[PDB]
Design a protein around this ligand. Structure first.
Ligand SMILES: OC[C@H]1O[C@@H](O[C@H]2[C@H](O)[C@@H](O)[C@H](O[C@H]3[C@H](O)[C@@H](O)[C@H](O[C@H]4[C@H](O)[C@@H](O)[C@H](O[C@H]5[C@H](O)[C@@H](O)[C@H](O[C@H]6[C@H](O)[C@@H](O)[C@H](O[C@H]7[C@H](O)[C@@H](O)[C@H](O)O[C@@H]7CO)O[C@@H]6CO)O[C@@H]5CO)O[C@@H]4CO)O[C@@H]3CO)O[C@@H]2CO)[C@H](O)[C@@H](O)[C@@H]1O
Ligand SMILES: [Mg+2]
Ligand SMILES: [Mg+2]
Length: 428
């Protein structure tokens, strides 16, 4: 095992994702924007194993690991390909747009180990792929739900399936010696608050303390998967800066959460886990696929500096935050923009920026009454209603875009926004 699988290697370029990118660029009138989409098609996105069919459907997990070898020989350097292990029973328990095919009360935990994990680790140990670095991101939006959403019965039912299921997946993956294991730990707009933060460091510690190799079973964590939270709020650098006689962490957008951006958040988690037993070799990944926040949307443009308005912390922070979402929990089909491009070791503690959620794939269907044949449990969630209000705080619009298909399907109108709003902007 290396300490950074992303150093000294190039990123796998999933051709099935780029097919959707290029075939839309072929359909895009504007010549400048179409050139940008062709450039976006060259970057490294992750490969989501989101159902048991995904192991075999199309080129399959095999064909991706095979295609990765084609790109390793072709380039001379090694290739790091990013797989997302995403099919726990009772999946996405606190929402409805990504409910999985396995569920606990239908012998789901047993099906998870037997039909999904086992065949994956089988393919992953074929010695033909020992020359790749295989990063495996373990079940986004799983353990975080057990910290803030156990009052919800769907998660409460699934705690053991999550722990036993995540432990089983990581134990059987540590045997493959070129797979690097990253546990998802959500984002700062979820676990930033003090008791949410502290509750996650306590839950995650025992989850891995019970793994086969203990604190050595994982290589780090990943944050901001499939979300829009920025790398850095540059014009709100200090959450304790007193404006109008109040610290600006008290603004209604943050509600006393001290972690405004994912860089402050991820590094805080890394120091916390280190001081509780984890080796200093752990590193955090940050999904930067849709957190650039360039362009203009939601009635605002990207700030070029702190706002002249010192009247309130609310007027100050709202005018200084790169994140323009009406409410920080607005997680669905947001009109953001592509963020930092995938790059290795951008700063101490961060292993690499990655694109885990592929730009262009939807977060959820935007109207009720539609069934996806391939994901029969994905449903309409009010957070994606383009005319609705957030179900976490009713006072704010969801901000979700309309005409969105079920989560995972290609969203051509959000992709155009994500490209136009990219920061750093797409250079053709
Ligand atoms: O085959 C087709 C193709 O399939 C492809 O793959 C797809 C795959 O199929 C998809 O399913 C997959 O999807 C992802 C979506 O893209 C994500 O958007 C989505 O994840 C959501 C999840 O649904 C949602 O439940 C979750 O919610 C969080 C939210 O992020 C967070 O902001 C919020 O925070 C709360 C917090 O919890 C509270 O504690 C908090 O409290 C404070 C309070 O406000 C304050 O008043 C008080 O003072 O203090 C309190 C603190 O104590 O409030 C906050 C509210 O702001 O909490 C929510 C949970 O409750 O968010 C996630 C996203 O972050 O779901 C999935 C997984 O992420 O994507 C893949 C790829 O696209 C294949 O690729 C392709 O090949 C196929 O063709
Ligand atoms: Mg490391
Ligand atoms: Mg900061």
């Amino acid at each position: 095992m290396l300490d950074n699988p992303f150093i000294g290697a190039i990123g796998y370029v999933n051709p099935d994702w780029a097919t959707n990118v290029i075939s839309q660029a072929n359909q895009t009138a504007d010549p400048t924007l179409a050139a940008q989409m062709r450039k976006v098609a060259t970057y490294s996105t992750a490969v989501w194993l989101d159902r048991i069919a995904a192991i075999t459907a199309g080129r399959g997990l095999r064909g991706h690991l095979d295609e990765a070898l084609r790109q390793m020989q072709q380039a001379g350097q090694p290739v790091v390909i990013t797989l997302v292990i995403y099919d726990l029973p009772n999946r996405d328990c606190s929402a409805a747009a990504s409910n999985g095919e396995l569920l606990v009360a239908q012998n789901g935990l047993a099906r998870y180990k037997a039909e999904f994990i086992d065949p994956i680790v089988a393919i992953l140990s074929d010695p033909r792929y020992a020359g790749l670095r295989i990063v495996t991101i373990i079940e986004p939006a799983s353990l975080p739900n057990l910290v803030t959403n156990l009052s919800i019965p769907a998660c409460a039912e699934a705690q053991n399936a999550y722990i036993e299921g995540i432990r089983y997946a990581v134990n059987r993956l540590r045997t493959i010696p070129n797979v690097y294991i990253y546990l998802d730990i959500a984002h700062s707009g979820w676990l930033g608050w003090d008791n949410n933060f502290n509750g996650a460091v306590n839950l995650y510690t025992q989850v891995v303390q019970g793994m086969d190799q203990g604190f050595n079973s994982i290589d780090g964590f990943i944050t901001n998967v499939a979300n829009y939270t920025p790398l850095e709020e540059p014009y709100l650098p200090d959450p304790n800066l007193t404006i109008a006689g109040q610290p600006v962490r008290s603004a209604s957008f943050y509600e006393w959460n001290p972690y405004f951006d994912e860089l402050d958040y991820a590094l805080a988690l890394r120091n916390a886990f280190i001081g509780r037993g984890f080796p200093s070799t752990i590193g955090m990944l940050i999904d930067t696929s849709r957190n650039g926040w360039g362009g203009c949307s939601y009635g605002r443009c990207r700030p070029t500096g702190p706002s002249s308005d010192t009247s309130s912390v609310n007027a100050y922070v709202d005018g200084s935050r790169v994140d323009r979402r009406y409410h920080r929990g607005n997680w669905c089909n947001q009109a953001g923009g592509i963020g930092e491009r995938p790059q290795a070791a951008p700063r101490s503690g961060i292993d690499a920026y990655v694109w885990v959620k592929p730009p262009g794939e939807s977060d959820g269907v935007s109207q009720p009454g539609i069934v996806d044949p391939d994901d029969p449990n994905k449903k309409f969630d009010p957070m994606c209603d383009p005319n609705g209000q957030s179900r976490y705080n009713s006072a704010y619009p969801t901000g979700a875009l309309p005409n969105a298909p079920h989560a995972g399907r290609w969203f051509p109108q959000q992709f155009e926004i994500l490209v136009r709003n990219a920061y750093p902007p797409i250079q053709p």
